[PDB]
Design a protein around this ligand. Structure first.
Ligand SMILES: CCCOc1ccc([C@@H]2c3c(-c4ccccc4O)n[nH]c3C(=O)N2Cc2cccnc2)cc1OC
Length: 381
């Protein structure tokens, strides 16, 4: 079972208990660490996102080496350099993928870059390719990228670089952007972004990552859930061993319009900002645990098999130990390739919740143990 985890190189800048560096990783937590993110130049060459990624005078070894140095104490761990994300937008992807020669510049620059900095593969999180032009250029990029990685491996004798992508879970996005049959043979696996189905961008109070649909939400959304999107990628021609189910350690929240209307499918505006994530409508597991300690009421959605909590006018959809174990039993029963996490930094990665029994990574640990057979230690002696 492939169990990748996203490392974000800006989580080191969060405050106090939220500060996350690679040294907070613990062996066997993941089989793959995706480094979010690598960056691009206007000419589509590759560069570091953060100067602190490279060995420097101020931070020292730098985040690339500090993440890759994790492979000495986790001897089966592989790393990948990810490109894109939502903040990256699409204008630079659209230009880079526009021609054989613009793609090759990125492809050659990227393969060189990852071999220089110790990564075992290249992850494309273009969010999102859209339309016939994009759809064909995206298929050309992944085929040409894999083609170059095979060559480089053939020439060098090294194990071939991995070629993955974080991909959309929404049916309309999936249709407008991805020629799956022409993509599947050139991908090692895809990180299915089976979350952000509902969110503060809209008034519809819903679930970030419902495993199944619920009749509490209007039928028009029956496809916006983990099970439907994974099936959709399988049905369009991605093999299951390549579909890695996405797992959020963050949650999405709302300021209710009516404090006594607390059911899924009510209406609201973005949630109040939380202390450490500092993004309205988003919040981390280590923040939700404190809400539960400070009086929030925990609810379980039986149809969608995920929790929500309510505290005053604050309504939060999130994931916990129960929803994680239910999604992992889901992954095994249905035979998908494994599960990945967005992100390591939103789990209670240091058993720092006031409520914590000491378990490091209470959420991600369930994936190590239920998919990997790995027991993550408790903090302390
Ligand atoms: C669909 C709209 C959801 O809104 C999102 C906004 C941003 C990201 C996230 C992100 C950020 C970012 C980081 C910390 C705090 C605020 C931010 O806006 N910077 N780059 C990225 C990124 O790619 N994100 C999404 C992502 C990429 C790959 C895999 N999983 C998630 C995410 C949002 O949800 C997508």
């Amino acid at each position: 079972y492939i169990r990748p985890c996203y490392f974000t190189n800006w989580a080191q800048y969060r405050q106090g208990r939220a500060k996350f560096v690679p040294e907070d990783y613990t062996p066997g937590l993941c089989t793959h660490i995706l480094f979010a993110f690598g960056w691009m130049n206007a000419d589509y060459t590759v560069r570091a996102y953060d100067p602190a990624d490279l060995p420097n005078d101020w931070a020292g070894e730098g985040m690339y080496r500090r993440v890759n140095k994790l492979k000495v104490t986790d001897t089966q761990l592989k790393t990948l350099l990810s490109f894109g994300g939502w903040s990256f937008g699409t204008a630079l992807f659209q230009g880079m993928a526009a021609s054989s020669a613009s793609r090759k510049v990125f492809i050659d620059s990227a393969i060189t870059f990852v071999r220089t900095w110790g990564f075992d593969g290249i992850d494309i999180d273009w969010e999102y390719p859209s339309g016939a032009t994009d759809m064909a250029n995206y298929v050309a990029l992944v085929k040409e990228l894999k083609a170059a990685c095979e060559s480089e491996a053939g020439s060098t004798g090294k194990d071939r670089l991995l070629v993955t992508a974080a991909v959309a879970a929404g049916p309309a996005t999936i249709d407008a952007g991805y020629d799956i049959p022409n993509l599947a043979p050139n991908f090692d696996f895809i990180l299915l972004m089976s979350y952000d189905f509902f969110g503060a961008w809209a008034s519809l109070v819903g679930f970030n990552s419902p495993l199944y649909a619920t009749t509490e939400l209007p039928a028009e959304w029956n496809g916006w859930n983990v099970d439907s999107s994974a099936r959709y990628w399988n049905q369009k021609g991605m093999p299951k061993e390549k579909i890695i189910v996405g797992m959020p350690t963050y949650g999405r929240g709302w300021t209710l319009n009516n404090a006594s209307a607390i059911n899924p499918g009510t209406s609201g505006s973005p949630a109040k900002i939380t202390q450490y994530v500092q993004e309205a409508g988003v919040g981390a597991y280590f923040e939700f645990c404190e809400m539960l300690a400070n009086g929030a009421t925990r609810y379980w959605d039986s149809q969608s098999q995920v929790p929500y909590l309510v505290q005053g006018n604050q309504w939060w959809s999130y994931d916990d130990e129960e929803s994680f174990a239910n999604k992992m039993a889901y992954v095994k029963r249905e035979g998908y390739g494994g599960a990945f996490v967005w992100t390591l930094d939103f789990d209670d990665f240091n058993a720092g919740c006031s409520n914590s029994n000491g378990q490091l990574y209470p959420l991600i640990s369930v994936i190590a143990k239920e998919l990997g057979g790995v027991i993550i230690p408790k903090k302390g002696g």
